[PDB]
Design a protein around this ligand. Sequence first.
Ligand SMILES: [Mg+2]
Ligand SMILES: [Mg+2]
Ligand SMILES: [Mg+2]
Ligand SMILES: [Mg+2]
Ligand SMILES: [Mg+2]
Ligand SMILES: [Mg+2]
Ligand SMILES: [Mg+2]
Ligand SMILES: [Mg+2]
Ligand SMILES: [Mg+2]
Ligand SMILES: [Mg+2]
Ligand SMILES: [Mg+2]
Ligand SMILES: [Mg+2]
Lengths: 100, 267, 55, 51, 117, 88
Amino acid sequence: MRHYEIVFMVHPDQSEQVPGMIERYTAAITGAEGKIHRLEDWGRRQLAYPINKLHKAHYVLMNVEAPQEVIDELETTFRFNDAVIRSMVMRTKHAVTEAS
Amino acid sequence: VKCKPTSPGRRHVVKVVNPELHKGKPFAPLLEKNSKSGGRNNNGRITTRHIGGGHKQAYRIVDFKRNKDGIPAVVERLEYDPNRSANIALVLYKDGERRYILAPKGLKAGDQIQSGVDAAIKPGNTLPMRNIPVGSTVHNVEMKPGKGGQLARSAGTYVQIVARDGAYVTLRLRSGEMRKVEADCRATLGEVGNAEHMLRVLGKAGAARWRGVRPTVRGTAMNPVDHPHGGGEGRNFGKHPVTPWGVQTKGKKTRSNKRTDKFIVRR
Amino acid sequence: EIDYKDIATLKNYITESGKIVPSRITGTRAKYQRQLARAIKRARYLSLLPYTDRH
Amino acid sequence: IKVRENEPFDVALRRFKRSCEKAGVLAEVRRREFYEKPTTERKRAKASAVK
Amino acid sequence: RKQVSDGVAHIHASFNNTIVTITDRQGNALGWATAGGSGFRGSRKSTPFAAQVAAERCADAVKEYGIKNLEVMVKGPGPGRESTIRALNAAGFRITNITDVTPIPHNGCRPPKKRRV
Amino acid sequence: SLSTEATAKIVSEFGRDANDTGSTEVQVALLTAQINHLQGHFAEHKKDHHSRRGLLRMVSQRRKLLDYLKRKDVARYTRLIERLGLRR
RNA sequence: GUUUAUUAAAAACACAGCACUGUGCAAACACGAAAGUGGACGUAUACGGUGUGACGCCUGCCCGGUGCCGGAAGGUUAAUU
RNA sequence: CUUGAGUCUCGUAGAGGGGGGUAGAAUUCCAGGUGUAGCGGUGAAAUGCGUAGAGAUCUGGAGGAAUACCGGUGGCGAAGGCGGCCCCCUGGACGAAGACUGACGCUCAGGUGCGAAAGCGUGGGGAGCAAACAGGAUUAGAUACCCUGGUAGUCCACGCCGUAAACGAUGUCGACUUGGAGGUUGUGCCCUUGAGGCGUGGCUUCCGGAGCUAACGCGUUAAGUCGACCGCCUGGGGAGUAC
Ligand SMILES: [Mg+2]
Ligand SMILES: [Mg+2]
Ligand SMILES: [Mg+2]
Ligand SMILES: [Mg+2]
Ligand SMILES: [Mg+2]
Ligand SMILES: [Mg+2]
Ligand SMILES: [Mg+2]
Ligand SMILES: [Mg+2]
Ligand SMILES: [Mg+2]
Ligand SMILES: [Mg+2]
Ligand SMILES: [Mg+2]
Ligand SMILES: [Mg+2]
C-alpha cells in the first residue's frame, strides 16, 4: 500500500459531526487492510481568508497508509458533503507520526 | 468527431453521406410495452401546420417521472426508440419490474441506478432537486413536482442548477436562458443521451428525409394567393411572411400564467 | 520544512504581504528555497497562511 | 500593505510597503506584455549585473 | 446631515487624472473630488500639487457632516498617491490607516499591446 | 517503471541461475512486461508522446537483444520467444 | 425525383446542406364563435417560419429610407373621473 | 575476457509528458445601494461613455483566460517546448556500495514518428487581447504609427498543415590536450562541534593559455589534436522561381 496525509476542514457550525466523520473514515481504512499511524483534532480556528465564507473552520489530520483505491473513494464522500469546506490530501513521503 | 465511437461515413458511390448507428445494443427487436401511434398531420378536418407525411412508424414505448423509488434497477440493455434520438435502455428492478428510462451516457452493462430521495448521485435515476448539489448536469426535470416533462430530448440535452438556490426554484435550460422551477420536483440527475446521435446528415432527401416529413420547403414559389408574396418577373422584393406572421423576429408568448422565469438575453 | 503545518517557521520567510521572500536575501542553499516556497503555496489553501493581504 | 499608528502624525511608514509591489509591478503591466522580449532582455540585463 | 463621524477615503490615483471620494464606513458616497473638475483640465492636472487642490475640495462638500477621522485607500499609480493623503492631513481630518488597494493580479488577463512610436 | 515484486520476480524465472539480472533471457523478458503493461496505458491519453519515446526505446532495445541471442545460440532464441508469446 | 390531367418536363418545383429568426411546453404556430385537435403521447441535438439550394474557395462597404430588436427618462396622446 | 553497451538494487533533483481536479488575485459583464457632473483618452485633441445618472464607491452573481511573489547568470526535454496547489497513469537523467549479461556497439540513404506560431475542417467556448473592418487625430497626403471600438483568432476536443532568424546560424558517437572564478544536483569523508572544511561524479555560466582562425573570435560543453558514420556547398541576379 501507499502512505497518505489528508487534512479536512469541516464547516464551523458542524463541528459536532467531525467526531462522527472520523469514525466512518477511520473504520473504512481499517476495513481496507490499511493502517492509521497519525491523528489529531485541531478544532475551530481563525482563517487567513474567509474561504467559502465565514472566518473559521474545524481542522483535522490523518496520515493513513490504506491502498489508494479505497482513499479515492473518499474524494467522493468528501465532495458530496457540504459539511467539509475544503479537502486537501498529499501523498505518502513515508510514514509520519506524532509531532505536527 | 471527438469521442468513442466515431460515426461511419458512407463513401461516394451513389450520392451518399453520413448515416447513424450505435456501438450496439444486441438484439434487433424490442419488448412489448407500446401502443400503435397516430398517423398524419391534419386536425379533424384541415391540414393544420403544413408539412408532415411519409410512412414507417409504430412503436410508442414509455416511462418518465419514475414514481417508484428506493428499489435497485439494473440496465437490461440500451435500445433504439423512433422519432426521438435519445436511446432508451431497459432496466429491471429487484422485483421483476421493468420501466424504460432515457438512456444516459455511461450506462449499458447493468449498473447501479436508484430513485427516490437520498440516492447515489451518479446517473441512476430521478431525484428531487432539493436532494441535489449543484447538478451542473441533472436531466429531464418537470415544471411541476409530478410529471417528468421538461427536456426529454435527452440527446445531449442538459440543465445546470446553481449549487444551492433557496426559495425552492432554479435550473438553466440550454438556450432557455434562466428559469426558476418548483424545487419539490425531481431530476434524473444523469443528463445525457449521446450527442453524436445527432451529428450525421440525413443524406439526400428521399431515403433520409421523406422517411419522416414532406417537402417542408415552399419558398416564394410566387402565385400571389398561395402565399403573401408571389408573381414578379422572376424575383422577390418586399415582405415574405406567411399569414403576416412577420418573420422579423417579433417574439410572442405574452401575459398569462408562467412568464416568471429570468435573465433571458437577446445577443 | 517539507510540509505546511509548521506554519510557525514560515511567517519569517514572508512579510506584511505574505509574499514568498526571495532567495537572494536568504541564500537558503537553493535546494531548500525550492521546498520552502512549495509549502507556502499549498499551505495557503488550508488558510493556514494568507495569499495576499488586502482581503 | 496595512498601515496604522497611535499619536496622530503624518510621518509615513507607507514607503515601507513601497518595496515589494507598488509602482513597479504596476507599470510592469501598464502597456503590453513581453513574451520573447523578456526572456531575452531579462537574460541580458543579467549580464549587466556582473560589474 | 447624517454625521458619519468616520469613513475611509478612496484615492483613485491614475495617470491622465486622479480622483478622491470620501465615502463612509460601509462604502457609501459622501463626497468626491476630481482634478478634471478642479479648474485646470486638459492634462495640466495629473501633477501631485494639482490633485491636492482637488481632494481638498471634498472638505467643502463632505464637510456637511462632521468627519472627525478617516482612513485612506490609495489605488493605482500616478501623481496623486501621496499628494492626496497630505492635503487631507492638513485639511483638518485625522487618520486611522493608510493602504494601497491597487489591482495587482497574478498574470490573469493579457494587457493591451498598445503604444509603439 | 516497474514494481520490485515483479522485476525481482521474473528475473528468477528466466535466469539460468540465481539473481542473474544480467542474462539476456532475463533482461529481454523483463522488457516485454513493462512494454505490454504500458500498451494499456498508451491506449489511454494517447497524446502522451514523451512517454512513448521511452516505450519505443525498450522495444528496439529489446529487439537489439533478440538479434544477439540468434547470433549466440540459435536454440535459446526460439526457446524464449515462445515463453513470451513474442513474434505475434 | 416533381410539374401545367387535355399545346410548356425546363434553366422552373423539390432535394440533402447552409443561415437567419421564433418557441420554456397549457410551446411558437395552425383548424376552431367555443369545447376540443394538430404540433407531439414530441420538449431546444426539439418544433415552426423565412431565404439560399451538393461540394470547393468564398460571401466585401452602407443602418441614411422602410421594417424589426432594445430603451422608455422627457413631449403628445383614448376610454374613464 | 571486461573497461564499451545494457540489466538488477537503493536513493536524488526536476516547469518532462497525458488525464482529472482545485485555489487565490485581477479584468469584463449583470443586478442593487450610496452619490453627482464629469469620466475616458492624448503631445495635445477628438471619436466614445455621462443628467435615461457615468466615472468613483460598496454588496451580491455570472464567466473566461492566465497563474504575482518564489524566479535565478535556475531546472527538465531529442527537438519544438515546459511555471499556481492536489491526485492518477507515465518517460528520461544522475550517484553509490555493489550483483549480473558478455561487444549484445557507433553512425544511418530510404522509412516511421514527433513539429512554435499563423492557418484549415467539424463541434464547443469566448473575459482580456486583437489581423479585418469603422470612427476620431496626425499629415502635403497617412489605405500607417496614436486614440475609441472591434470580427476571425487567440482557449477546448478531435483531425489536417508541416514551416520559423525551428539558431549555439556550430550533425551524432568516442579518446586525448595548461588554468581561474561561479551556478545546480548526487555521494564519500572531517573535533560532522559551524554557516561549515576536504575530496569524488552529472549537468551548466563567465574569463582565458597552447593551438586553431581571414578577422571577429572558439578555447576540455573547442571552432584545438584525432578516429567512425551521415547531411550539405561549388559566383551574384534570374530563383527556392518555372515545369
Ligand atoms: Mg410560377
Ligand atoms: Mg403565372
Ligand atoms: Mg395577397
Ligand atoms: Mg487598435
Ligand atoms: Mg431526372
Ligand atoms: Mg400540357
Ligand atoms: Mg409536353
Ligand atoms: Mg433559388
Ligand atoms: Mg539539455
Ligand atoms: Mg495553433
Ligand atoms: Mg479553429
Ligand atoms: Mg573563452
